[PDB]
Structure formats: C-alpha cells, structure tokens
Amino acid sequence: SRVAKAPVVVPAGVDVKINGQVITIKGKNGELTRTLNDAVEVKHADNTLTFGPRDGYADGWAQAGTARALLNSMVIGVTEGFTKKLQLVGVGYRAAVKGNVINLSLGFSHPVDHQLPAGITAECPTQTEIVLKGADKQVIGQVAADLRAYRRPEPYKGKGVRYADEVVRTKEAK
Amino acid sequence: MKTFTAKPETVKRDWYVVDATGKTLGRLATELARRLRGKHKAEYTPHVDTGDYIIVLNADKVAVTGNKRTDKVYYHHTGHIGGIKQATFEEMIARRPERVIEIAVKGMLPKGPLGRAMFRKLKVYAGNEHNHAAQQPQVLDI
Amino acid sequence: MTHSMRL
Amino acid sequence: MKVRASVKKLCRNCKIVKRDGVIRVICSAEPKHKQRQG
Amino acid sequence: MIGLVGKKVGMTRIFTEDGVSIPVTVIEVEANRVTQVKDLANDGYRAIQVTTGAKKANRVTKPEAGHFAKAGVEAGRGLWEFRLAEGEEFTVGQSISVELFADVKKVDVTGTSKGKGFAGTVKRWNFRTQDATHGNSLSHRVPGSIGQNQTPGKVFKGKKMAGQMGNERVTVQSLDVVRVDAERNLLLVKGAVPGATGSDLIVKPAVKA
RNA sequence: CGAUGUCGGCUCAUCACAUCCUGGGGCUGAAGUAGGUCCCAAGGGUAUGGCUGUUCGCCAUUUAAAGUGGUACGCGAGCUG
RNA sequence: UGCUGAAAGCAUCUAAGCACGAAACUUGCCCCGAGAUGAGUUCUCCCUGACCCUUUAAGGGUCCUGAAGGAACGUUGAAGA
Ligand SMILES: CC[C@H]1OC(=O)[C@H](C)[C@@H](O[C@H]2C[C@@](C)(OC)[C@@H](O)[C@H](C)O2)[C@H](C)[C@@H](O[C@@H]2O[C@H](C)C[C@H](N(C)C)[C@H]2O)[C@](C)(O)C[C@@H](C)C(=O)[C@H](C)[C@@H](O)[C@]1(C)O
C-alpha cells in the first residue's frame, strides 16, 4: 500500500522488458528475471514502473508491495550489486577460496567444500574474511546463510562463522 | 400396457473423448459418472447399462481447489498384519495419475456387477494421445 | 472339582 | 522453547507472529521468551 | 554389468600362503551364448537372453528348436535374462566367459535352495519348543497360540505357521571372489551358495557396493 | 444362570503412543563430559537369576534400554494346574 | 532453522516466492506376483480336406486326417504327505 504507491526510479541501462507477467532486466552487473504474481499490475509510464492492484483478487496491496520491493532490490542488484561480508571468529578457522568452491577449514575433522551458484563470486582478503559479491539478493543471502549454517556462532567464546558487524551476545559460563 | 425397458443387444453406445486439463476433480468425475451410467439418454433403464464409452485424456493436469493438492490423503489397506498404507494427492498424481480419476469415478458409481461393467466403459489416460482412433471419439466438452 | 466352574 | 496453550508478551521486545498457522512469540533480546502453540 | 549362469560343483577350501584357509564354492561357468536381445523398440526394456550347457537333440521341442535356430546359437538347458544396465550392447551368439568376473571383487549368487519339505514351526520359524516334562500333554513342538480372542476373532494374515520349507529362490549378496580360472572355466567364491551340488546358479556382480 | 472355564507360568503374538534405547531439534541456572526439561518421531530393539503360587515387589548382576498400556485384566476345542 | 518480503515506511521463516531438515513416509536390497477378468508383452512352433441337412446360424451332422504338443506308463530324483 504505502510501499506499493511509490514508483521505482529505474536508472542507467534499464532493459526492463515485460512479457505477460514476467519481468526481465539486463544491467551493469548482469541479468535478473522473475514471474510476478497475478494480483499485481505493472506499468511503464513516465520512465519508471508503477504497481497497482489487479481487479478481482482480495490480496492486492500486499502482493503489489512485495512486487515493488523485490523488483526494487533486483534492479539495484543489476545496477551496482549486493555484497555480503562474513568473518570467522575462532582459532584454527581458515577460509581459503578455490575459484567457485569455498574450502572452509572449520576444524571438524575434514575440509568443507562449498559449491557456489553461477552468480556469486567470492574473495578472501585475509583468511578469516569471506566477501560474497552478487547481483541477486536472495541468492547471496541464501549462500551466506548456508555458509553460516555450516558452523553457527558459539554463545561462550564467540567461535563460529558470523556476519560482519552483527553482534553476538555471549553468556558467561556460569 | 407396460413401460419401456431397454434391451442389452439393441442399445447403441457412443464414444467420447474428454480433455481433463485444468478442470476440477469432482465436478468432472460427476459428469463422467452421469454419462457412464446412461442417465442422459431418454431410454434409461436401471438394470441395463445405457451409458457411453469415455476416453479421459490428460489425467495429469486435473486440478483441486484449496490445499487439497497436498492434503487429500488416499487410504487403502493391504489386508495384512496392520499395514494401512496412505498416499496424498501429490504422490498419487506423480506415481499413478489415472488412479485419481478412476477412484473418483468408482466412488460415484453403483456397486454391483452392473457398476463394474459401467466402470469398464471408462478409459483414463494421462497423456494427450490415445490409441482409440478407430472408434471415432467425438469431443464431449464440459 | 471347581476349576472350570465359575464359583 | 515453551509449548503452551497461552502465549503472552513476557518481554518488551517480543513480537507475536502467526507462522504456519500457529501463534508464536519471538523475543530478539533473549531466547528464553520464545514460545509456541498459543 | 550382467551376470553369468553356472553350476554348483561342490565345496572345498583353499589355503592362502599366509596360513589362512578359506572355504570356496566352485562354480562351473560354461560359455554363455546370447540367444535373443531385447531392446526398448519392441519390448520397452532392454535385456539379453542367454543359455548354457547342452541338451539331447531328441529332447528338444520344435518351439525351442526354432527359437535356438533363429539366431546363431545351439541348444542349452534353460534360458535366462539379464537386464543390461545402461551401456552394454551384445550381438546374438556372443560367447560370454568368466573374464568379467576376473575383474570384479564381490558377487551375488542366486539359486534355488534345498527343499526341506513340509517343516514345522520349530524348523521353519525358529519357534521355541515348550516343556518336555512338568506335566506337558501332547504339546511339545506344537505352535502354541495362533491368535488372541473375540476382538480380532480371526487369525492374522502372515501368521507364521508350518508348511513348505526350502525349494525357493534365495540370493546371497557380497561374496568375495577368490580365484577365476579361465582354462577350466571355473569360479571360486568364498562361502556357501544356495542349492544342492549340481544346481544351476546365477552369478551377478554385487549391487550393494 | 436349557454354562461366556478363573489368577500366575509357557508358547505365540498384535496394536496404540502418553518414547525406555536409538534418531532429530528448542531452551537451560548448557565451558567440555554428563545431565534437566519440552517438541517431532512407533523403523527396529526392549535382560538373566534368588525369594514368592504370585502379577507386583525387594535383591544380585548386566545392558544402548530392562517403556507404558489395549487385545474376554490377549492366548486351557494350544500346554500347565 | 533460514533467505528475500510486504500486509503494518519498521519489524517479520510467509501471505507471493526460495532453501535446508530425522531410524518415520516413497524408493533403493530381497522374495512372491498377469485369475493384474484392466487376465499384459516378446520370440518360436504347428495345422492349407471333401461333402449333405435344417430353426441358412459365431448352426448341426457324416467320412477322411490327426499336427505342434500334452497326458498316460516305466526308471527315478540332495523334488515330494
Ligand atoms: C473324561 C471325559 C469327561 O469330561 C471330563 O472329564 C472333563 C475334563 C470335565 O471336566 C471335569 C474336570 C474339571 C477340572 O474341568 C476340567 C472340573 O472343573 C469339571 C467340573 O469336571 C467336563 C469338561 C465337565 O464340564 C465342565 O463342568 C463345569 C461345571 C462347567 C464347565 N463350563 C463352565 C466350561 C464344563 O466344561 C463335565 C461336567 O464333567 C462335563 C459333563 C458333560 C460330563 O460329565 C461328561 C460326561 C464328562 O464327564 C466326560 C466328557 O466324559
């Protein structure tokens, strides 16, 4: 509603082509597409797409706001792209990167091999610092969630894979 | 006088082909059972099979409203130690698509030998094609 | 002999 | 967590959500106030 | 890959030079000639059909005579099929000897087990014999109780009772091959395979790897 | 009431789940080890003896564990008595 | 347990969408199984004669031929009441 009644300013190499209910976008970083819901209406007046509720359906405004939000961060990803920073707190934890397959050494007994999607690239400046660079926000967020879910943060030492400036509350060991 | 009765040698049966794509399950099944018993013909007889042969194409694409695609459970019992087997609508559509249509129609038919014969009239396929092209199946839309 | 009997 | 028939706001930061058709209470400030089934 | 059909020829033991003795079953694996090849054009599934051995020319009926003389092979006893798992192509009349089992390490042997006849519940289902003394009356190796009472009111299906024991198809899995003789067309496997001596065995490579 | 044979033991079971073990998780006044408590889960498993007619119980010694109930307090045209 | 995400400018595992997640469920292993009357498929083999009658019918009868195969019999079997 308040989200959906605000059009999205689409900048710099827009390529926002429509096919029925499908939105395809080429951009600076790449190309992202999605099939939208059937209760939403998109329109390409005034250089910038506007979202209305389609007739007949009950849930119009929430679907339209969800559509506006996903297309907004989607076209933001095709403009400049999303990044995610993970760090490894804890001794014996190294995170060397081999191309498209991250090889974590979280010290279970064996290495951890992690195949990436076709989109997100990964870089390590130091050995406790993974930086994911990808356009599609859900895929980089999902792969950061998988990499954290290999080994969670510990509430006693702070040991584990964690997000960058996310604060972990460590209870002291009684 | 006596009322008219049909005779099983002179009843003249038609062939129909029904595309079951994108339709509701039980509405289609009710129309199928009505056509199978013969209640659409004027010379209806309750002990003579009057109905027609129906070829139901595309049993894969049948639809169910609500959350029945994941939660309509089919129960059947193997007649054994304590094995009550069960399968939802999704794995029944994937594993054995024609069984959904045949179960829905067989629940709607009379029980007895006449109902089993009028169920043998029904021929359910999951593809778009059938091998019954030698009987000229007319399109029965519903 | 009261073994089968309900006594 | 606490599976209960009565879920209430124990804390200032716990919000009441309805996930998967069940009523749950999430406190982001402490995990002892997490509860279910209300 | 496919299995081969052989014959159970006794049991012996071989002595490894380390000192260990291992019991082997010797399987005479004769030349298996492929009679008919199934493919998914006509049949819907792909397979091969093999035969082995020999039969009397007067003991062969004209149906199986014509079926053998259709494609290149000679009369053996029995016909068997093998299911060709993804990537084998065999011409009819192709002799298949025991070199594929010279490569392999574990094996599955399928045979018809020895028929123990009408057996009781003690022999068939390892039931516990009741008391031999302390009062017992005509009920030493009887099966006990077979059901509860009025509430089921019936015996359950699959209740273990007496009946035919033996004489059925049994597969034994993961038997180690210890030696393959190609000039004798023999196969030594470790352990015991189902059947009497001289019974026909089916030898497939192991699936539970 | 012109008859529906009891308690216990033996033999054979079968189901429920309100789970004893195994398996999966949340919280912990959870450092680890080991627990407590709650949620999911019924595939498989789930002692031997002494005493007692005993079920039960106590006890000795194990076990991963020594589940709780229904089935005419399952089961005598199957046995015992 | 999550990711993205509004409804509800925030927040939110959820309404749209996406991913994980157990000895339970469906497969994978093994055995039975086309009486699966919805009685399936594949290959091979065997039959290539004349006439009359009547309610000229998916009809009866007569002579001549009995084919593949089967059964019977016998010797029997680590098969079997
Ligand atoms: C030789 C064979 C004899 O039977 C037995 O010895 C058995 C072993 C008795 O049990 C003997 C021994 C014993 C201990 O039961 C085993 C004892 O309790 C009874 C009273 O007598 C029987 C069966 C008794 O029945 C029982 O009578 C009970 C009153 C009720 C019971 N019913 C509820 C189920 C019923 O079956 C009873 C009365 O003798 C049956 C009547 C018909 C007879 O007299 C007949 C002629 C018998 O003598 C007999 C068949 O020749």
JSON list of N, CA, C and O (backbone and C1' of nucleotides) in Angstrom, two decimals, chain G residues 15-39:
[
{"chain": "G", "resi": 15, "resn": "A", "atom": "P", "xyz": [1.71, -18.41, 6.55]},
{"chain": "G", "resi": 15, "resn": "A", "atom": "O5'", "xyz": [0.84, -17.59, 5.51]},
{"chain": "G", "resi": 15, "resn": "A", "atom": "C5'", "xyz": [1.28, -17.48, 4.16]},
{"chain": "G", "resi": 15, "resn": "A", "atom": "C4'", "xyz": [0.50, -16.45, 3.37]},
{"chain": "G", "resi": 15, "resn": "A", "atom": "C3'", "xyz": [0.88, -16.34, 1.91]},
{"chain": "G", "resi": 15, "resn": "A", "atom": "O3'", "xyz": [0.29, -17.34, 1.10]},
{"chain": "G", "resi": 15, "resn": "A", "atom": "C1'", "xyz": [0.78, -14.18, 2.84]},
{"chain": "G", "resi": 16, "resn": "A", "atom": "P", "xyz": [1.20, -18.22, 0.11]},
{"chain": "G", "resi": 16, "resn": "A", "atom": "O5'", "xyz": [1.86, -17.14, -0.85]},
{"chain": "G", "resi": 16, "resn": "A", "atom": "C5'", "xyz": [1.07, -16.45, -1.80]},
{"chain": "G", "resi": 16, "resn": "A", "atom": "C4'", "xyz": [1.92, -15.87, -2.91]},
{"chain": "G", "resi": 16, "resn": "A", "atom": "C3'", "xyz": [3.14, -16.67, -3.32]},
{"chain": "G", "resi": 16, "resn": "A", "atom": "O3'", "xyz": [2.84, -17.80, -4.10]},
{"chain": "G", "resi": 16, "resn": "A", "atom": "C1'", "xyz": [3.71, -14.39, -3.17]},
{"chain": "G", "resi": 17, "resn": "G", "atom": "P", "xyz": [3.55, -19.20, -3.76]},
{"chain": "G", "resi": 17, "resn": "G", "atom": "O5'", "xyz": [5.10, -18.93, -4.02]},
{"chain": "G", "resi": 17, "resn": "G", "atom": "C5'", "xyz": [5.59, -18.69, -5.33]},
{"chain": "G", "resi": 17, "resn": "G", "atom": "C4'", "xyz": [6.97, -18.10, -5.33]},
{"chain": "G", "resi": 17, "resn": "G", "atom": "C3'", "xyz": [8.10, -19.01, -4.88]},
{"chain": "G", "resi": 17, "resn": "G", "atom": "O3'", "xyz": [8.50, -19.96, -5.85]},
{"chain": "G", "resi": 17, "resn": "G", "atom": "C1'", "xyz": [8.36, -16.92, -3.85]},
{"chain": "G", "resi": 18, "resn": "C", "atom": "P", "xyz": [8.86, -21.45, -5.37]},
{"chain": "G", "resi": 18, "resn": "C", "atom": "O5'", "xyz": [10.30, -21.30, -4.70]},
{"chain": "G", "resi": 18, "resn": "C", "atom": "C5'", "xyz": [11.40, -20.80, -5.44]},
{"chain": "G", "resi": 18, "resn": "C", "atom": "C4'", "xyz": [12.61, -20.57, -4.57]},
{"chain": "G", "resi": 18, "resn": "C", "atom": "C3'", "xyz": [13.12, -21.78, -3.81]},
{"chain": "G", "resi": 18, "resn": "C", "atom": "O3'", "xyz": [13.84, -22.70, -4.61]},
{"chain": "G", "resi": 18, "resn": "C", "atom": "C1'", "xyz": [13.12, -19.89, -2.40]},
{"chain": "G", "resi": 19, "resn": "A", "atom": "P", "xyz": [13.77, -24.26, -4.26]},
{"chain": "G", "resi": 19, "resn": "A", "atom": "O5'", "xyz": [14.67, -24.39, -2.94]},
{"chain": "G", "resi": 19, "resn": "A", "atom": "C5'", "xyz": [16.06, -24.17, -3.02]},
{"chain": "G", "resi": 19, "resn": "A", "atom": "C4'", "xyz": [16.71, -23.93, -1.68]},
{"chain": "G", "resi": 19, "resn": "A", "atom": "C3'", "xyz": [16.98, -25.15, -0.82]},
{"chain": "G", "resi": 19, "resn": "A", "atom": "O3'", "xyz": [18.08, -25.90, -1.29]},
{"chain": "G", "resi": 19, "resn": "A", "atom": "C1'", "xyz": [16.27, -23.32, 0.52]},
{"chain": "G", "resi": 20, "resn": "C", "atom": "P", "xyz": [18.02, -27.50, -1.27]},
{"chain": "G", "resi": 20, "resn": "C", "atom": "O5'", "xyz": [18.72, -27.88, 0.10]},
{"chain": "G", "resi": 20, "resn": "C", "atom": "C5'", "xyz": [17.94, -28.35, 1.18]},
{"chain": "G", "resi": 20, "resn": "C", "atom": "C4'", "xyz": [18.51, -27.93, 2.51]},
{"chain": "G", "resi": 20, "resn": "C", "atom": "C3'", "xyz": [18.42, -28.97, 3.60]},
{"chain": "G", "resi": 20, "resn": "C", "atom": "O3'", "xyz": [19.50, -29.88, 3.57]},
{"chain": "G", "resi": 20, "resn": "C", "atom": "C1'", "xyz": [17.61, -26.90, 4.41]},
{"chain": "G", "resi": 21, "resn": "G", "atom": "P", "xyz": [19.25, -31.46, 3.76]},
{"chain": "G", "resi": 21, "resn": "G", "atom": "O5'", "xyz": [18.46, -31.56, 5.13]},
{"chain": "G", "resi": 21, "resn": "G", "atom": "C5'", "xyz": [19.11, -31.37, 6.38]},
{"chain": "G", "resi": 21, "resn": "G", "atom": "C4'", "xyz": [18.10, -31.32, 7.50]},
{"chain": "G", "resi": 21, "resn": "G", "atom": "C3'", "xyz": [17.18, -32.52, 7.59]},
{"chain": "G", "resi": 21, "resn": "G", "atom": "O3'", "xyz": [17.78, -33.61, 8.24]},
{"chain": "G", "resi": 21, "resn": "G", "atom": "C1'", "xyz": [15.91, -30.54, 7.78]},
{"chain": "G", "resi": 22, "resn": "A", "atom": "P", "xyz": [18.38, -34.83, 7.39]},
{"chain": "G", "resi": 22, "resn": "A", "atom": "O5'", "xyz": [18.42, -36.02, 8.43]},
{"chain": "G", "resi": 22, "resn": "A", "atom": "C5'", "xyz": [17.38, -36.97, 8.45]},
{"chain": "G", "resi": 22, "resn": "A", "atom": "C4'", "xyz": [17.00, -37.37, 9.84]},
{"chain": "G", "resi": 22, "resn": "A", "atom": "C3'", "xyz": [16.40, -38.75, 9.96]},
{"chain": "G", "resi": 22, "resn": "A", "atom": "O3'", "xyz": [17.38, -39.76, 10.07]},
{"chain": "G", "resi": 22, "resn": "A", "atom": "C1'", "xyz": [15.02, -37.20, 11.08]},
{"chain": "G", "resi": 23, "resn": "A", "atom": "P", "xyz": [17.85, -40.59, 8.77]},
{"chain": "G", "resi": 23, "resn": "A", "atom": "O5'", "xyz": [17.51, -42.09, 9.15]},
{"chain": "G", "resi": 23, "resn": "A", "atom": "C5'", "xyz": [16.19, -42.46, 9.47]},
{"chain": "G", "resi": 23, "resn": "A", "atom": "C4'", "xyz": [16.16, -43.84, 10.06]},
{"chain": "G", "resi": 23, "resn": "A", "atom": "C3'", "xyz": [14.80, -44.51, 10.16]},
{"chain": "G", "resi": 23, "resn": "A", "atom": "O3'", "xyz": [14.37, -45.07, 8.93]},
{"chain": "G", "resi": 23, "resn": "A", "atom": "C1'", "xyz": [15.98, -44.80, 12.18]},
{"chain": "G", "resi": 24, "resn": "A", "atom": "P", "xyz": [13.15, -44.45, 8.10]},
{"chain": "G", "resi": 24, "resn": "A", "atom": "O5'", "xyz": [12.02, -44.16, 9.18]},
{"chain": "G", "resi": 24, "resn": "A", "atom": "C5'", "xyz": [11.20, -45.19, 9.69]},
{"chain": "G", "resi": 24, "resn": "A", "atom": "C4'", "xyz": [9.91, -44.64, 10.24]},
{"chain": "G", "resi": 24, "resn": "A", "atom": "C3'", "xyz": [8.83, -44.38, 9.20]},
{"chain": "G", "resi": 24, "resn": "A", "atom": "O3'", "xyz": [8.05, -45.53, 8.94]},
{"chain": "G", "resi": 24, "resn": "A", "atom": "C1'", "xyz": [9.14, -42.43, 10.49]},
{"chain": "G", "resi": 25, "resn": "C", "atom": "P", "xyz": [7.96, -46.17, 7.47]},
{"chain": "G", "resi": 25, "resn": "C", "atom": "O5'", "xyz": [7.33, -45.03, 6.58]},
{"chain": "G", "resi": 25, "resn": "C", "atom": "C5'", "xyz": [5.93, -44.79, 6.57]},
{"chain": "G", "resi": 25, "resn": "C", "atom": "C4'", "xyz": [5.57, -43.78, 5.52]},
{"chain": "G", "resi": 25, "resn": "C", "atom": "C3'", "xyz": [5.98, -44.13, 4.10]},
{"chain": "G", "resi": 25, "resn": "C", "atom": "O3'", "xyz": [5.06, -45.00, 3.47]},
{"chain": "G", "resi": 25, "resn": "C", "atom": "C1'", "xyz": [6.65, -41.92, 4.58]},
{"chain": "G", "resi": 26, "resn": "U", "atom": "P", "xyz": [5.59, -46.25, 2.62]},
{"chain": "G", "resi": 26, "resn": "U", "atom": "O5'", "xyz": [6.12, -45.60, 1.28]},
{"chain": "G", "resi": 26, "resn": "U", "atom": "C5'", "xyz": [5.24, -44.99, 0.36]},
{"chain": "G", "resi": 26, "resn": "U", "atom": "C4'", "xyz": [6.00, -44.45, -0.82]},
{"chain": "G", "resi": 26, "resn": "U", "atom": "C3'", "xyz": [7.00, -45.40, -1.44]},
{"chain": "G", "resi": 26, "resn": "U", "atom": "O3'", "xyz": [6.41, -46.32, -2.33]},
{"chain": "G", "resi": 26, "resn": "U", "atom": "C1'", "xyz": [8.01, -43.29, -1.13]},
{"chain": "G", "resi": 27, "resn": "U", "atom": "P", "xyz": [7.19, -47.67, -2.71]},
{"chain": "G", "resi": 27, "resn": "U", "atom": "O5'", "xyz": [8.22, -47.21, -3.83]},
{"chain": "G", "resi": 27, "resn": "U", "atom": "C5'", "xyz": [9.43, -47.91, -4.03]},
{"chain": "G", "resi": 27, "resn": "U", "atom": "C4'", "xyz": [10.53, -47.01, -4.52]},
{"chain": "G", "resi": 27, "resn": "U", "atom": "C3'", "xyz": [11.89, -47.67, -4.63]},
{"chain": "G", "resi": 27, "resn": "U", "atom": "O3'", "xyz": [12.04, -48.41, -5.83]},
{"chain": "G", "resi": 27, "resn": "U", "atom": "C1'", "xyz": [12.12, -45.62, -3.50]},
{"chain": "G", "resi": 28, "resn": "G", "atom": "P", "xyz": [12.60, -49.91, -5.77]},
{"chain": "G", "resi": 28, "resn": "G", "atom": "O5'", "xyz": [14.12, -49.73, -5.35]},
{"chain": "G", "resi": 28, "resn": "G", "atom": "C5'", "xyz": [15.04, -49.05, -6.19]},
{"chain": "G", "resi": 28, "resn": "G", "atom": "C4'", "xyz": [16.34, -48.76, -5.47]},
{"chain": "G", "resi": 28, "resn": "G", "atom": "C3'", "xyz": [17.02, -49.96, -4.84]},
{"chain": "G", "resi": 28, "resn": "G", "atom": "O3'", "xyz": [17.80, -50.70, -5.77]},
{"chain": "G", "resi": 28, "resn": "G", "atom": "C1'", "xyz": [16.92, -48.20, -3.28]},
{"chain": "G", "resi": 29, "resn": "C", "atom": "P", "xyz": [17.41, -52.21, -6.12]},
{"chain": "G", "resi": 29, "resn": "C", "atom": "O5'", "xyz": [17.74, -53.02, -4.80]},
{"chain": "G", "resi": 29, "resn": "C", "atom": "C5'", "xyz": [19.07, -53.12, -4.32]},
{"chain": "G", "resi": 29, "resn": "C", "atom": "C4'", "xyz": [19.17, -54.11, -3.20]},
{"chain": "G", "resi": 29, "resn": "C", "atom": "C3'", "xyz": [18.35, -55.37, -3.39]},
{"chain": "G", "resi": 29, "resn": "C", "atom": "O3'", "xyz": [19.02, -56.32, -4.19]},
{"chain": "G", "resi": 29, "resn": "C", "atom": "C1'", "xyz": [18.03, -54.51, -1.20]},
{"chain": "G", "resi": 30, "resn": "C", "atom": "P", "xyz": [18.20, -57.23, -5.22]},
{"chain": "G", "resi": 30, "resn": "C", "atom": "O5'", "xyz": [17.44, -58.26, -4.29]},
{"chain": "G", "resi": 30, "resn": "C", "atom": "C5'", "xyz": [18.16, -59.26, -3.59]},
{"chain": "G", "resi": 30, "resn": "C", "atom": "C4'", "xyz": [17.28, -59.95, -2.58]},
{"chain": "G", "resi": 30, "resn": "C", "atom": "C3'", "xyz": [16.04, -60.62, -3.13]},
{"chain": "G", "resi": 30, "resn": "C", "atom": "O3'", "xyz": [16.29, -61.88, -3.71]},
{"chain": "G", "resi": 30, "resn": "C", "atom": "C1'", "xyz": [15.47, -59.35, -1.23]},
{"chain": "G", "resi": 31, "resn": "C", "atom": "P", "xyz": [15.55, -62.30, -5.07]},
{"chain": "G", "resi": 31, "resn": "C", "atom": "O5'", "xyz": [14.16, -62.90, -4.57]},
{"chain": "G", "resi": 31, "resn": "C", "atom": "C5'", "xyz": [14.12, -64.06, -3.75]},
{"chain": "G", "resi": 31, "resn": "C", "atom": "C4'", "xyz": [12.78, -64.22, -3.08]},
{"chain": "G", "resi": 31, "resn": "C", "atom": "C3'", "xyz": [11.57, -64.30, -3.99]},
{"chain": "G", "resi": 31, "resn": "C", "atom": "O3'", "xyz": [11.37, -65.58, -4.56]},
{"chain": "G", "resi": 31, "resn": "C", "atom": "C1'", "xyz": [11.12, -62.80, -2.24]},
{"chain": "G", "resi": 32, "resn": "C", "atom": "P", "xyz": [10.69, -65.71, -6.01]},
{"chain": "G", "resi": 32, "resn": "C", "atom": "O5'", "xyz": [9.15, -65.43, -5.75]},
{"chain": "G", "resi": 32, "resn": "C", "atom": "C5'", "xyz": [8.36, -66.37, -5.03]},
{"chain": "G", "resi": 32, "resn": "C", "atom": "C4'", "xyz": [6.99, -65.83, -4.74]},
{"chain": "G", "resi": 32, "resn": "C", "atom": "C3'", "xyz": [6.12, -65.54, -5.95]},
{"chain": "G", "resi": 32, "resn": "C", "atom": "O3'", "xyz": [5.49, -66.70, -6.47]},
{"chain": "G", "resi": 32, "resn": "C", "atom": "C1'", "xyz": [6.00, -63.73, -4.44]},
{"chain": "G", "resi": 33, "resn": "G", "atom": "P", "xyz": [5.33, -66.88, -8.05]},
{"chain": "G", "resi": 33, "resn": "G", "atom": "O5'", "xyz": [4.49, -65.61, -8.52]},
{"chain": "G", "resi": 33, "resn": "G", "atom": "C5'", "xyz": [3.08, -65.56, -8.35]},
{"chain": "G", "resi": 33, "resn": "G", "atom": "C4'", "xyz": [2.54, -64.16, -8.54]},
{"chain": "G", "resi": 33, "resn": "G", "atom": "C3'", "xyz": [2.61, -63.60, -9.95]},
{"chain": "G", "resi": 33, "resn": "G", "atom": "O3'", "xyz": [1.59, -64.07, -10.79]},
{"chain": "G", "resi": 33, "resn": "G", "atom": "C1'", "xyz": [3.37, -61.98, -8.43]},
{"chain": "G", "resi": 34, "resn": "A", "atom": "P", "xyz": [1.90, -64.39, -12.32]},
{"chain": "G", "resi": 34, "resn": "A", "atom": "O5'", "xyz": [0.59, -63.93, -13.06]},
{"chain": "G", "resi": 34, "resn": "A", "atom": "C5'", "xyz": [-0.17, -62.82, -12.59]},
{"chain": "G", "resi": 34, "resn": "A", "atom": "C4'", "xyz": [-1.22, -62.44, -13.59]},
{"chain": "G", "resi": 34, "resn": "A", "atom": "C3'", "xyz": [-1.24, -63.30, -14.85]},
{"chain": "G", "resi": 34, "resn": "A", "atom": "O3'", "xyz": [-2.57, -63.43, -15.33]},
{"chain": "G", "resi": 34, "resn": "A", "atom": "C1'", "xyz": [-0.86, -61.06, -15.43]},
{"chain": "G", "resi": 35, "resn": "G", "atom": "P", "xyz": [-3.49, -64.64, -14.82]},
{"chain": "G", "resi": 35, "resn": "G", "atom": "O5'", "xyz": [-4.18, -64.05, -13.53]},
{"chain": "G", "resi": 35, "resn": "G", "atom": "C5'", "xyz": [-5.07, -62.95, -13.59]},
{"chain": "G", "resi": 35, "resn": "G", "atom": "C4'", "xyz": [-6.21, -63.18, -12.64]},
{"chain": "G", "resi": 35, "resn": "G", "atom": "C3'", "xyz": [-5.77, -63.60, -11.25]},
{"chain": "G", "resi": 35, "resn": "G", "atom": "O3'", "xyz": [-5.53, -62.52, -10.38]},
{"chain": "G", "resi": 35, "resn": "G", "atom": "C1'", "xyz": [-7.30, -65.18, -12.10]},
{"chain": "G", "resi": 36, "resn": "A", "atom": "P", "xyz": [-4.02, -62.13, -9.98]},
{"chain": "G", "resi": 36, "resn": "A", "atom": "O5'", "xyz": [-3.84, -60.68, -10.59]},
{"chain": "G", "resi": 36, "resn": "A", "atom": "C5'", "xyz": [-4.50, -59.57, -10.01]},
{"chain": "G", "resi": 36, "resn": "A", "atom": "C4'", "xyz": [-4.81, -58.47, -10.99]},
{"chain": "G", "resi": 36, "resn": "A", "atom": "C3'", "xyz": [-5.27, -58.90, -12.38]},
{"chain": "G", "resi": 36, "resn": "A", "atom": "O3'", "xyz": [-6.23, -57.96, -12.84]},
{"chain": "G", "resi": 36, "resn": "A", "atom": "C1'", "xyz": [-3.39, -57.50, -12.58]},
{"chain": "G", "resi": 37, "resn": "U", "atom": "P", "xyz": [-7.76, -58.12, -12.41]},
{"chain": "G", "resi": 37, "resn": "U", "atom": "O5'", "xyz": [-8.52, -58.19, -13.79]},
{"chain": "G", "resi": 37, "resn": "U", "atom": "C5'", "xyz": [-8.29, -59.26, -14.68]},
{"chain": "G", "resi": 37, "resn": "U", "atom": "C4'", "xyz": [-9.43, -59.39, -15.65]},
{"chain": "G", "resi": 37, "resn": "U", "atom": "C3'", "xyz": [-10.72, -58.71, -15.22]},
{"chain": "G", "resi": 37, "resn": "U", "atom": "O3'", "xyz": [-11.40, -58.24, -16.38]},
{"chain": "G", "resi": 37, "resn": "U", "atom": "C1'", "xyz": [-11.11, -61.00, -15.51]},
{"chain": "G", "resi": 38, "resn": "G", "atom": "P", "xyz": [-12.01, -56.76, -16.41]},
{"chain": "G", "resi": 38, "resn": "G", "atom": "O5'", "xyz": [-10.77, -55.84, -16.78]},
{"chain": "G", "resi": 38, "resn": "G", "atom": "C5'", "xyz": [-10.42, -55.60, -18.13]},
{"chain": "G", "resi": 38, "resn": "G", "atom": "C4'", "xyz": [-9.00, -55.12, -18.29]},
{"chain": "G", "resi": 38, "resn": "G", "atom": "C3'", "xyz": [-7.92, -56.07, -17.77]},
{"chain": "G", "resi": 38, "resn": "G", "atom": "O3'", "xyz": [-6.78, -56.00, -18.63]},
{"chain": "G", "resi": 38, "resn": "G", "atom": "C1'", "xyz": [-7.75, -53.99, -16.66]},
{"chain": "G", "resi": 39, "resn": "A", "atom": "P", "xyz": [-6.59, -57.06, -19.82]},
{"chain": "G", "resi": 39, "resn": "A", "atom": "O5'", "xyz": [-6.27, -58.42, -19.07]},
{"chain": "G", "resi": 39, "resn": "A", "atom": "C5'", "xyz": [-5.05, -58.60, -18.37]},
{"chain": "G", "resi": 39, "resn": "A", "atom": "C4'", "xyz": [-4.84, -60.05, -18.02]},
{"chain": "G", "resi": 39, "resn": "A", "atom": "C3'", "xyz": [-4.88, -61.02, -19.19]},
{"chain": "G", "resi": 39, "resn": "A", "atom": "O3'", "xyz": [-3.68, -61.07, -19.93]},
{"chain": "G", "resi": 39, "resn": "A", "atom": "C1'", "xyz": [-6.26, -61.83, -17.48]}
]
